[PDB]
Design a protein around this ligand. Structure first.
Ligand SMILES: [Cl-]
Length: 290
């Protein structure tokens, strides 16, 4: 058993050179494998096939679900007898000992990674699979496409942007150091949540995100909002109440048609090469509307 030594979030892992059958426990890792022409044998897909973004899903084809990302089914992982498991370094600390009894296990950032950290996880996966050159090629293509979309996005970058999900009668905002915040910065946007602004709102943190009620949204008054919702729907009971709010109606972004509702699976959950390309393409399209 010859191996390739790579670094992951727990130290060194010796990955077998004959690793071909791989179980992945986050969506971004499925994207990584598809980009490298590898079809995972198992995916933690939350029992929801549509959570795997379409071009990735269609390239991989048939696979076995191993359950939720929160609580993967280790009997189903065992039964697959994989060569390698790719686990999330935040979600899967508790199951790590059990996963290592089944197969060599890489522990990589996805859930608590920003945009650059997710691309770093892609690089580690490529190296682990003896596909370093293929990964370099793919990332050069990705970067060229992202910068082409950047130049086609017509929006005025002086209009500061707030990315968020809907929660608890307000918005649960993704700050400038989140995956989405950092990606928007890569596209030349200015996040409304500057470091100074976020410092002055920190009593409202809920883990990685900032809970903004309408009073605090009114004070921030970002010129643009991107609101990520399941299925890109805007008619949830929660989001409808938020809008009957007198303060919401006076917001600059609302008065001027600069609130866009986008798909949460693509924008928040996927964290892949294909999904980030799709986010950028969507911004081009929105910017070219009448
Ligand atoms: Cl997620």
């Amino acid at each position: 058993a010859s191996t390739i030594s790579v670094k992951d979030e727990n130290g060194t892992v010796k990955v077998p050179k004959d690793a071909k059958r791989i179980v992945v426990l986050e969506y971004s890792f499925a994207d990584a494998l598809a980009a490298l022409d590898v079809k995972p044998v198992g995916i933690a897909d939350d029992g929801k096939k549509k959570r795997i973004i379409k071009p990735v899903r269609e390239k991989i084809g048939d696979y076995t679900s191993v359950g939720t990302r929160k609580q993967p089914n280790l009997e189903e992982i065992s039964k697959l007898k994989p060569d390698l498991i790719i686990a999330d370094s935040s979600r899967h600390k508790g199951i790590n000992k059990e996963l290592n009894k089944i197969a060599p296990t890489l522990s990589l950032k996805s859930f608590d990674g920003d945009y650059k950290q997710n691309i770093n996880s892609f690089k580690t996966i490529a190296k682990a699979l003896n596909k370093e050159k293929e990964g370099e090629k793919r990332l050069a293509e990705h970067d060229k496409l992202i910068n082409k979309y950047k130049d086609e996005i017509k929006f005025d970058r002086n209009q500061k942007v707030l990315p968020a999900v809907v929660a608890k009668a307000g918005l649960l905002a993704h700050p400038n150091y989140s995956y989405v915040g950092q990606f928007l910065n890569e596209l030349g946007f200015k996040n409304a949540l500057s470091d100074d602004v976020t410092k002055g709102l920190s009593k409202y943190l809920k883990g990685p995100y900032l809970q903004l009620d309408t009073e605090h949204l009114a004070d921030l008054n970002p010129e643009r909002m991107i609101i990520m919702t399941d299925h890109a729907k805007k008619d949830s009971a929660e989001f409808k109440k938020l809008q009957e709010d007198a303060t919401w109606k006076k917001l600059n972004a609302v008065k001027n048609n600069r609130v866009d509702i986008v798909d949460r699976d693509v924008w928040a959950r996927s964290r892949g090469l294909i999904s980030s390309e799709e986010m950028a393409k969507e911004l081009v399209e929105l910017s070219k509307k009448e």
